[PDB]
Amino acid sequence: HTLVWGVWVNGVDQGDGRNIYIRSPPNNNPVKNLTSPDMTCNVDNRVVPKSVPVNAGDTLTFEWYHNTRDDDIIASSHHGPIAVYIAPAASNGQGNVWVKLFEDAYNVTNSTWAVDRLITAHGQHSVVVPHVAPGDYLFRAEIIALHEADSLYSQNPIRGAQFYISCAQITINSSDDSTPLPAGVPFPGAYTDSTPGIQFNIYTTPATSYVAPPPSVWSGALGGSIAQVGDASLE
Numbered sequence: 001h002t003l004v005w006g007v008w009v010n011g012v013d014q015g016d017g018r019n020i021y022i023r024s025p026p027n028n029n030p031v032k033n034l035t036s037p038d039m040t041c042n043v044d045n046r047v048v049p050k051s052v053p054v055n056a057g058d059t060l061t062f063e064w065y066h067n068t069r070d071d072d073i074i075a076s077s078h079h080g081p082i083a084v085y086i087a088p089a090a091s092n093g094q095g096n097v098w099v100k101l102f103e104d105a106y107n108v109t110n111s112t113w114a115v116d117r118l119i120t121a122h123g124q125h126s127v128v129v130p131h132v133a134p135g136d137y138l139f140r141a142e143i144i145a146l147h148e149a150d151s152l153y154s155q156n157p158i159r160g161a162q163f164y165i166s167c168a169q170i171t172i173n174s175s176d177d178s179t180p181l182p183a184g185v186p187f188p189g190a191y192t193d194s195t196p197g198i199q200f201n202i203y204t205t206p207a208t209s210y211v212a213p214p215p216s217v218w219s220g221a222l223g224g225s226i227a228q229v230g231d232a233s234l235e
């Protein structure tokens with residue numbers, strides 16, 4: 001159980017974004033149904049009144065939390081990968097529009113899943129804003145907790161992979177559009193019961209064997225990291 005509080009741009013807190021520039025759900029419950037419209041932007045997908053201004057090459061940092069800001073973030077049991085997608089705002093997230101900007105599953109050197117590192121990062125993970133057309137966008141951050149992913153939700157609705165999905169409204173002002181956005185995948189639709197990384201046993205299969213669900217990261221993407229960029233406690 002986890003939610004987004006807000007974002008930072010180039011290491012500068014943009015402030016509490018909940019129901020303001022984040023299309024926040026009312027609580028931190030996971031989405032499990034792969035076929036639900038809730039896969040798009042969680043259970044309350046609607047236009048919220050602000051959109052965060054950024055330029056290509058900026059560092060955009062999602063900040064997650066559990067019950068309160070900068071707490072334990074997400075329960076340590078919730079081992080799994082983290083991805084970030086982008087789509088044009090005009091889509092409202094419908095159709096084949098989501099382009100993957102970032103993937104992190106398991107780090108062999110440190111022996112840590114993305115979620116494990118997100119905790120250590122005080123909930124913060126970033127992407128570098130790509131050189132797409134100026135305009136309004138949705139950035140869809142997705143955490144997949146795998147602690148009950150040995151079962152499929154479609155077969156046993158009390159278990160299943162757990163999706164913590166947050167959409168941020170982001171406006172890209174300065175960009176040369178030198179890497180125009182390509183074709184994306186649909187949510188719901190891209191992940192099915194047979195997709196790699198949706199059904200997995202984290203307890204008996206070595207984490208080095210895990211493969212995260214496709215699509216693969218777009219070649220136009222400019223990187224990201226799971227790492228603290230700002231200290232929330234100073235505010």
Ligand SMILES: *[C@@H]1O[C@H](CO)[C@@H](O)[C@H](O)[C@H]1NC(C)=O
Nearest residue numbers: 033034035036037153154157
């Ligand atoms: C999953 O979502 C689909 C599409 O909305 C829906 O028809 C189905 O009833 C859902 N499954 C459960 C178990 O609620």
Ligand SMILES: O[C@@H]1[C@@H](O)[C@H](O)OC[C@H]1O
Nearest residue numbers: 001002027028029066067
């Ligand atoms: O559902 C519970 C949620 O309310 C809390 O925030 O995190 C622990 C969960 O069990």
Ligand SMILES: [Cl-]
Nearest residue numbers: 001002074075
């Ligand atoms: Cl929890």
Ligand SMILES: [Cl-]
Nearest residue numbers: 014015016017
């Ligand atoms: Cl604030």
Ligand SMILES: [Cl-]
Nearest residue numbers: 030031032033
């Ligand atoms: Cl669900």
Ligand SMILES: [Cl-]
Nearest residue numbers: 049050051052
């Ligand atoms: Cl605005």
Ligand SMILES: [Cl-]
Nearest residue numbers: 065067068069
């Ligand atoms: Cl809070």
Ligand SMILES: [Cl-]
Nearest residue numbers: 120121227228
């Ligand atoms: Cl860190």
Ligand SMILES: [Cl-]
Nearest residue numbers: 001147148162
């Ligand atoms: Cl749970």
Ligand SMILES: [Cl-]
Nearest residue numbers: 056174175176
């Ligand atoms: Cl540019």
Ligand SMILES: [Cl-]
Nearest residue numbers: 034035188189
């Ligand atoms: Cl579907």
Ligand SMILES: [Cl-]
Nearest residue numbers: 126127224225
């Ligand atoms: Cl980064």
Ligand SMILES: [Cu+2]
Nearest residue numbers: 001002075078
């Ligand atoms: Cu949880």
